[PDB]
Amino acid sequence: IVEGSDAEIGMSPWQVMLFRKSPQELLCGASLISDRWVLTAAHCLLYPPWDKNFTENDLLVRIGKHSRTRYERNIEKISMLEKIYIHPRYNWRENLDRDIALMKLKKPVAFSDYIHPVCLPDRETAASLLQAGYKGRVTGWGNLKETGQPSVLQVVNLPIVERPVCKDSTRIRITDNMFCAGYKPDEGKRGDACEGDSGGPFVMKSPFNNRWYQMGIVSWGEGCDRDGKYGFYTHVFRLKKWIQKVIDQFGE
Amino acid sequence: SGEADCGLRPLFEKKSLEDKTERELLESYIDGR
Amino acid sequence: XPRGGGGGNGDXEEIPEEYL
C-alpha cells in the first residue's frame, strides 16, 4: 500500500497472508469469507508468462496477522490448503479478466477478536454501494513505494471512479468484471495498492446494516500511485454465482 | 451475506467502537446510516 | 500489469515446524 496508514488491531479481521512454504515468503493477500474458504486473485496462483503455477502444496495461509514478518505466537493461525479453484475463464492471456480464485482450507478456522469473515455482497448491496465517488478500503502488507515493506498491515481508502475515466487511462481492455479506484490528479489526495497487495480485499461498510462487504479483489495496475492512473479490482458481485457454485459443489 | 455474523468486527462493531477512518467512507455515501 | 507478489527477502521469522 502507497500513502496508507497502519491498520489498528482487529480493523480487518478477514485479512489473510498467502505465504510461500520455501522460500518462506509473502505471496499475496487473500480474505476469509467463511471458516473454511478463502478468496484471492487467480494471478496469485497462476500466471504462466512468469512461470507462476502454485499448487496447494506450495502454500500456507496465515490468518489474524498484524506484523508483516513475525510469527504472532498466540494470535495468528496458519493453515494448509485442501484444494485450489480458479475461474475456468480467468483470462491470463490478455487482461486479467475474472482474476479470482477460491481456496478451501484443510480445517475450519476458529473465529476470535482477530479472525472474522467479511460478507459477500448481494445484488442490492452492490447496486447501492458501487458508485463513482464512494470510498472503499484496501489493506495489505505490500509495497510502500512503486520503487519498502511495511512492518504492520497498511490501509488506505479510495473513491470508486467512473467507467470512462477507467477506460481512458490505459491501453488494456477493461471488462465488466473489473472496476478501477483511486484519486484524480485534480483531487490531490493519493494512495493505491502495490505489488504484494494483490489478491487482497477492497471493502465497503454498508450504511444500512453497518456490515463490511468485500466488493473487489486487488487485481492489476500500471505502477503504484502514478497520477492519472488507477488500480483495478475484480468485481466480486459479478462473479458471485461462480462462487456459490463452487462452495455448493465442494465444501463447507 | 458472505457468512452470517459476517462483517461485524469483534473490536469495533460488536462493541460499538468506530475505527479511526471509517467515518471517511460513510460520509462519501452521502453521509450514511 | 498484474499486484504480482511481494516480500521474498527471508526477512521473515521462521514459522513452526508443525505449521509447515
Side-chain angles (χ1 to χ4, degrees):
Chain A
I1 298 303
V2 181
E3 292 284 291
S5 285
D6 295 356
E8 287 173 73
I9 308 288
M11 193 205 200
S12 169
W14 38 79
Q15 177 94 39
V16 169
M17 179 167 296
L18 274 231
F19 198 81
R20 220 174 161 177
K21 260 160 126 259
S22 158
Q24 309 246 254
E25 68 167 1
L26 175 142
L27 224 69
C28 288
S31 82
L32 195 70
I33 84 205
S34 128
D35 84 327
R36 258 269 219 142
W37 294 95
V38 164
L39 193 67
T40 197
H43 89 261
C44 288
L45 317 168
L46 180 59
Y47 197 60
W50 293 344
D51 284 315
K52 194 153 146 224
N53 172 1
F54 293 113
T55 49
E56 282 89 70
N57 304 301
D58 312 333
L59 345 133
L60 264 4
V61 126
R62 309 180 64 174
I63 320 166
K65 280 204 66 46
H66 189 65
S67 182
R68 176 191 133 270
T69 234
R70 299 134 150 153
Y71 176 57
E72 308 175 92
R73 191 150 38 100
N74 316 118
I75 330 287
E76 83 159 287
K77 247 66 254 144
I78 306 177
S79 347
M80 316 229 125
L81 296 173
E82 205 176 309
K83 174 49 187 156
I84 280 176
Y85 307 76
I86 301 178
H87 195 287
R89 301 254 273 162
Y90 157 46
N91 195 349
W92 57 260
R93 303 184 124 103
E94 137 235 5
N95 56 342
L96 255 52
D97 194 32
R98 307 158 182 106
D99 190 15
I100 185 170
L102 290 190
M103 327 168 87
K104 98 144 318 182
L105 314 183
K106 275 233 198 54
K107 327 200 204 142
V109 75
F111 308 147
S112 84
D113 289 353
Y114 316 100
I115 311 186
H116 198 91
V118 72
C119 305
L120 294 182
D122 45 288
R123 183 132 125 303
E124 335 5 290
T125 280
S128 40
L129 308 155
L130 251 198
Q131 295 201 40
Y134 291 16
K135 287 147 154 198
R137 180 170 285 179
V138 189
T139 50
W141 287 286
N143 275 357
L144 288 174
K145 253 209 202 228
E146 203 181 303
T147 198
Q149 25 224 230
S151 184
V152 114
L153 178 83
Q154 282 317 99
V155 60
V156 71
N157 298 329
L158 297 169
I160 293 322
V161 187
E162 301 77 359
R163 293 223 112 223
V165 186
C166 302
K167 286 170 218 217
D168 284 353
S169 67
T170 178
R171 279 160 92 143
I172 301 181
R173 193 186 59 81
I174 305 318
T175 85
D176 279 336
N177 305 312
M178 333 165 167
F179 70 79
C180 94
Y183 293 101
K184 290 168 179 139
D186 41 280
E187 331 190 281
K189 250 161 181 80
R190 281 217 154 252
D192 183 26
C194 207
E195 74 159 295
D197 290 327
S198 28
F202 175 99
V203 302
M204 276 175 112
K205 217 233 162 105
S206 171
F208 316 102
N209 67 180
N210 115 140
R211 285 185 197 255
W212 291 86
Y213 283 96
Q214 168 168 17
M215 308 310 279
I217 298 166
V218 176
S219 207
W220 59 264
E222 300 157 306
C224 310
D225 206 43
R226 315 234 192 95
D227 296 63
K229 292 229 158 206
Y230 309 80
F232 292 79
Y233 302 74
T234 321
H235 199 305
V236 191
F237 188 57
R238 284 217 123 221
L239 296 170
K240 224 280 201 45
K241 283 49 165 168
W242 170 68
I243 294 170
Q244 261 145 233
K245 211 161 53 8
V246 346
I247 273 138
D248 115 23
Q249 182 180 177
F250 356 59
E252 55 72 271
Chain B
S1 308
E3 235 267 6
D5 152 46
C6 75
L8 282 187
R9 297 158 315 163
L11 312 182
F12 296 93
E13 286 76 21
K14 317 289 203 25
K15 288 197 172 192
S16 208
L17 292 168
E18 271 229 329
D19 74 47
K20 11 269 230 223
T21 56
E22 51 187 287
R23 205 192 111 181
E24 175 190 6
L25 274 20
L26 292 298
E27 312 211 295
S28 68
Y29 309 164
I30 43 145
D31 233 357
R33 174 112 229 171
Chain C
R3 137 205 294 185
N9 27 285
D11 110 293
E13 185 169 336
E14 174 87 11
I15 73 218
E17 298 97 54
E18 175 178 4
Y19 263 5
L20 217 313

